[PDB]
Amino acid sequence: KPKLHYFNARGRMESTRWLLAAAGVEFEEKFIKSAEDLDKLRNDGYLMFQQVPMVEIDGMKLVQTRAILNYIASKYNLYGKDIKERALIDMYIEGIADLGEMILLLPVCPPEEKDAKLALIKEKIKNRYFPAFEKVLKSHGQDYLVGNKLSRADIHLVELLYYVEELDSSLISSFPLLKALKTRISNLPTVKKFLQPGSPRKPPMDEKSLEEARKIF
Amino acid sequence: KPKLHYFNARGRMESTRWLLAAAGVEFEEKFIKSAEDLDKLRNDGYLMFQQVPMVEIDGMKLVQTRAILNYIASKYNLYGKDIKERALIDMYIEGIADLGEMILLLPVEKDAKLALIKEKIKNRYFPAFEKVLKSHGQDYLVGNKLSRADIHLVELLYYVEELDSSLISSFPLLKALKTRISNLPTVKKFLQPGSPRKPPMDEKSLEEARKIF
Numbered sequence: 001k002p003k004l005h006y007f008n009a010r011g012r013m014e015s016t017r018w019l020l021a022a023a024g025v026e027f028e029e030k031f032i033k034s035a036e037d038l039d040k041l042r043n044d045g046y047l048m049f050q051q052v053p054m055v056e057i058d059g060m061k062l063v064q065t066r067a068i069l070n071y072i073a074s075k076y077n078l079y080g081k082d083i084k085e086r087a088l089i090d091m092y093i094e095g096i097a098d099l100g101e102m103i104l105l106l107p108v109c110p111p112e113e114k115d116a117k118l119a120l121i122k123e124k125i126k127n128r129y130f131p132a133f134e135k136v137l138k139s140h141g142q143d144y145l146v147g148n149k150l151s152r153a154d155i156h157l158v159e160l161l162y163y164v165e166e167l168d169s170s171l172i173s174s175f176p177l178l179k180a181l182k183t184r185i186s187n188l189p190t191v192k193k194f195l196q197p198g199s200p201r202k203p204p205m206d207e208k209s210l211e212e213a214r215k216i217f
Numbered sequence: 218k219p220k221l222h223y224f225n226a227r228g229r230m231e232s233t234r235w236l237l238a239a240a241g242v243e244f245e246e247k248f249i250k251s252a253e254d255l256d257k258l259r260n261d262g263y264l265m266f267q268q269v270p271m272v273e274i275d276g277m278k279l280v281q282t283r284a285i286l287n288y289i290a291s292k293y294n295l296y297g298k299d300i301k302e303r304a305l306i307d308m309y310i311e312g313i314a315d316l317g318e319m320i321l322l323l324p325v326e327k328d329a330k331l332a333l334i335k336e337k338i339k340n341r342y343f344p345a346f347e348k349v350l351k352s353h354g355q356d357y358l359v360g361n362k363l364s365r366a367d368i369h370l371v372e373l374l375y376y377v378e379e380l381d382s383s384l385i386s387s388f389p390l391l392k393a394l395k396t397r398i399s400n401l402p403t404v405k406k407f408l409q410p411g412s413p414r415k416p417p418m419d420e421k422s423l424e425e426a427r428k429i430f
């Protein structure tokens with residue numbers, strides 16, 4: 001079973017957790033608890049650029065978030081049916097990662113500029129990203145973003161919808177098709193199980209855990 | 218010809234220019250010069266996220282650097298022969314992308330950062346790739362066949378040279394890869410004068426990237 005090496009938090013590993021679970025793939029997690037736990041992965045030659053996330057899958061040690069996701073998405077037929085579909089998927093998920101990244105780094109952001117950063121994110125969500133995705137759905141009227149078949153684009157998008165909801169549950173209000181997508185995807189057997197309590201889904205970064213991050217890393 | 222929409226500068230479109238030319242594909246560039254030119258692309262509905270780079274290729278309008286490079290890489294078989302090779306390729310180029318993003322944003326805490334980038338190149342990135350080349354002793358990074366990994370790395374080797382030519386001294390293999398790749402007919406052509414390759418961003422286009430954006 002795929003072994004995911006990361007600390008006990010969402011961070012850069014959460015999208016992978018969401019994708020595997022959505023693919024109905026059982027995985028393992030080897031939690032880094034200290035800076036010393038990390039140094040060993042390094043000295044043990046497990047980390048190409050001395051960083052995590054690192055995932056042990058099918059005989060090799062993959063680092064770099066996108067390498068991990070691209071591999072899993074292709075293996076479990078969640079990367080579309082051809083080069084053109086992947087292009088759409090890629091364009092969609094890179095837009096999702098751009099927003100996800102901003103949200104992911106808000107708590108690491110220096111205090112004095114946290115307010116401006118959060119306002120900037122909410123503006124982009126309402127005027128740039130949510131409309132872009134709502135439009136995709138309204139254009140073709142299908143249940144999924146691409147090829148009228150479940151793909152990583154739908155998984156990454158809905159995962160983000162949950163983070164936007166925690167940030168401000170009003171942002172998605174004027175985007176019915178998105179709201180509807182979140183519901184459909186959330187009720188797919190695998191995703192519904194991942195969303196249930198006790199699953200490996202991680203909580204939003206709190207405090208004790210951010211302090212542990214700057215400590216380990 | 219694929220149509221590249223960006224402003225006359227390297228920025229986020231340079232890696233694409235290198236890839237297309239490496240694949241021997243001729244392209245056209247529609248240079249954005251003003252803030253209005255950028256607004257016209259938006260109003261015409263050509264930018265999914267209101268951003269560039271954006272490339273028109275095979276009938277689609279693709280934005281997002283990685284979406285563009287990924288498509289081009291696969292189309293011209295520069296993305297490995299299978300899923301496992303693509304993973305190695307992706308792992309390699311993403312490390313490259315990380316080091317590039319650092320340099321790409323440097324001009325936009327100056328000293329402290331520069332000294333950090335150099336240390337990472339010397340102690341983290343170059344050793345990682347040097348190690349790769351030594352592990353199999355082949356002319357290319359993956360599957361002993363040219364791939365986007367060779368092109369992006371070599372492109373980066375050039376940028377690192379412009380920054381400090383001494384940084385690649387303790388890495389003989391990276392040095393060698395750079396010479397073989399630069400000698401490939403297509404890459405050599407892109408390296409000679411008059412090619413679409415863009416110059417380092419000086420004071421100007423930095424203010425033009427400021428004005429246009």
Ligand SMILES: N[C@@H](CCC(=O)N[C@@H](CSCCN(CCCl)c1ccc(CCCC(=O)O)cc1)C(=O)NCC(=O)O)C(=O)O
Nearest residue numbers: 011012051052053064065103104105106107108205213217
């Ligand atoms: N492009 C790479 C980046 C990999 C990377 O940055 N790895 C970090 C760890 S990523 C997890 C830690 N981190 C980044 C700073 Cl360390 C981080 C963790 C959690 C958050 C979340 C903050 C709260 C929130 O999510 O809102 C943000 C950053 C690492 O190993 N650093 C050590 C080193 O470089 O020497 C990839 O995507 O794999």
Ligand SMILES: N[C@@H](CCC(=O)N[C@@H](CSCCN(CCCl)c1ccc(CCCC(=O)O)cc1)C(=O)NCC(=O)O)C(=O)O
Nearest residue numbers: 098228229268269270281282320321322323324418426430
């Ligand atoms: N994830 C996307 C991001 C695309 C993106 O950032 N596009 C920018 C333009 S990227 C080119 C400009 N730029 C980034 C700030 Cl705008 C930039 C340009 C040149 C340099 C290089 C400086 C010199 C050096 O390389 O050292 C750095 C940044 C854009 O169109 N913004 C408009 C908006 O958001 O409303 C992608 O990778 O395609």
